[PDB]
């Protein structure tokens, strides 16, 4: 019921901001803040009003709210929006990140600003629609239309048409690397539906009847690779992640909040929801390749993070290290491991968003991007580097932050299922420390005479500090007290694991 409205407010707000662009220029900032407030209101209403602590073994079909509507009846394509417990965590996270995106874009007036915000709400609404998606075509359409408006963001707002490096390399690799694999998973969807159409005799694009379709061995394996390729180019996996640092280092850091904190979520959401249950034996065969790619991703991202000299590419290469833990979590037979991935995933978004906001904040203070050029700014800034120290501290497994409990319950479940690949995996924490300290010492520890421009520094406004203070206190409560959201996700995680166990 609430789901059609909850995916449509982003699109309605873009229309109204661009409508009132003719009326005024200070309107869309204040319009956008209220519209994202309504998005979190409906999302938090579903958290509180709904039975978040529901039955742990109520089957694979279980939803607090559900919407159905005929869209293309010839294939049974329907607007099958349906919200689960873990999907509701995803919706509340993106509503909060949308508030941060529209708050960081405050006091940013240009030649056109309504165009920026209709695009801003369009891309955030696309991610919400992926998170509420049970029909395969609706899932794919939303997956691919959140991908078009970021291209305009990197192009027309990466820099205003002055340098050609903001389109022809950064934005173009971002677009092609995702869309080729999106078309791969579309033909994977179609091969799965056609083998189901031979089995039964109905053209259906719905998840519940495609869940248990009979397929011979050696056939569903190729479709599982087809799903995983599109789910491995969106979250950074080892062979195909070259788009991520270019995308984050060129887009404005509000666009980078969208590009890191929430676009990385949807691929592991799809690995939990759409790839694991549909292909149980194929995923059981593919598991060790996934573990090898996971350990390679953690070690690889940390080394490339240590070796880099700038900051946006630095945090962009932390992200690829973080997601390796999540991939190993998903491809195991443990309930605790999956519940560790969820808390690690929410904390991943919350620990990347603050760093990107602050890195963009530091650049507009000093007008210099290279990290090794500055140094010793602690005597000049009064609140930026202290808050930045805790966010760099929250990146690695420091307890009292959500990242520690996240990565570390994965390791418990991972050692429960398989010893040797887990005992390799744990060493990324040592490597997490070295790139964390490298960031901290090269940027803030030292003498302010490392740069001439490090001798005249501005002040920090109240609202940026307010939205940084909220994230640090929110992330500490998730580290100390993670029970409420684990009780929320228990049943959804449990039935996925029980199906992955029982179907093999």
């Amino acid at each position: 019921m609430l789901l059609p409205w909850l995916i449509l407010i982003p699109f309605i707000g873009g229309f109204l901001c661009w409508q009132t662009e003719r009326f005024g220029v200070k309107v869309p900032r204040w319009i956008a803040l209220i519209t994202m407030g309504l998005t979190l209101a409906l999302s938090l209403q579903l958290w509180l009003q709904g039975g978040y602590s529901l039955t742990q073994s109520a089957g694979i079909p279980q939803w607090q709210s559900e919407f159905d509507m005929p869209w293309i009846p010839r294939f049974g394509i329907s607007i099958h929006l349906a919200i689960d417990g873990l999907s509701l965590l995803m919706v509340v996270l993106t509503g909060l990140l949308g508030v941060l995106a529209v708050l960081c874009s405050w006091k940013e007036i240009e030649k056109y600003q309504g165009f920026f915000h209709l695009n801003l709400m369009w891309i955030l609404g696309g991610v919400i629609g992926v998170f509420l998606a049970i029909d395969m075509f609706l899932f794919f359409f939303f997956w691919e239309m959140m991908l078009v408006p970021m291209y305009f963001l990197i192009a027309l707002w990466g820099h205003k048409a002055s340098d050609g490096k903001t389109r022809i390399t950064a934005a173009t690799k971002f677009f092609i690397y995702t869309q080729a694999s999106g078309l791969v998973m579309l033909i994977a969807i179609l091969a799965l539906v056609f083998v189901h159409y031979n089995a039964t005799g109905v053209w259906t694009f719905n998840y519940e009847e495609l869940l248990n379709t009979p397929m011979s061995s050696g056939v569903e394996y190729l479709l599982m690779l087809g799903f995983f390729i599109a789910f491995a180019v969106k979250m950074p996996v080892v062979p195909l992640h070259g788009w991520l640092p270019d995308a984050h280092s060129q887009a404005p850091t509000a666009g980078s909040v969208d590009l890191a904190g929430i676009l990385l979520k949807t691929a592991a959401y799809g690995l939990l929801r759409f790839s694991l249950p549909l292909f149980p034996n194929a995923s059981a065969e593919f598991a060790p390749i996934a573990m090898w790619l996971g350990v390679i991703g953690i070690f690889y991202g940390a080394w490339m993070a240590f070796a880099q000299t700038d900051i946006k590419r630095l945090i962009a290469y932390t992200s690829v290290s973080h997601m390796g833990f999540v991939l190993i979590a998903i491809y195991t037979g443990s309930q605790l491991a999956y519940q560790g991935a969820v808390i690690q995933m929410i904390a991943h978004g919350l620990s990347a968003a603050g760093l990107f906001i602050l890195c963009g904040q530091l650049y507009e203070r000093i007008h210099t991007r290279d990290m090794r050029m500055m140094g010793g700014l602690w005597s000049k800034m009064k609140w930026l580097p202290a808050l930045s120290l805790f966010f760099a501290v929250a990146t690695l497994g420091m307890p009292g932050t959500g990242n520690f409990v996240g990565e570390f319950m994965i390791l418990f479940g991972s050692f429960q299922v398989v010893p040797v690949i887990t005992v390799i995996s744990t060493f990324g924490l040592v490597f997490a420390s070295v790139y964390s300290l490298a960031m901290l010492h090269r940027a803030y520890f030292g003498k302010a005479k490392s740069q001439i421009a490090s001798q005249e520094l501005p002040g920090m406004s109240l609202r940026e500090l307010f939205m940084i203070l909220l994230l640090v206190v929110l992330l500490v409560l998730l580290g100390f007290y993670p029970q409420p959201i684990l009780d929320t996700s228990h049943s959804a995680i449990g039935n996925i694991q029980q199906w992955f166990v029982n179907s093999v």
Binding site: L411, F412, F415, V423, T426, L429, V430, S433, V434, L437
Partner: protein, 55 residues
């Protein structure tokens, strides 16, 4: 260098922590004390890995 070296020790310390939860279930010290001999009627070879890596 102290920070790197102390986290190497902490990886070594958490290794025994995984093994103790896999073998004896509860991490409370006293409940561990009178749960350790109950669970160890058959196999003992893996406890040296737990305790050496705890050390």
């Amino acid at each position: 260098k102290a920070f790197v070296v102390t986290r190497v020790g902490d990886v070594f310390l958490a290794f025994a922590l995984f093994i103790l939860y896999n073998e004896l279930g509860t991490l409370n010290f006293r409940e561990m004390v009178e749960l350790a001999p109950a669970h160890f009627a058959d196999g003992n070879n893996m406890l040296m890995w737990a305790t050496l890596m705890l050390l």
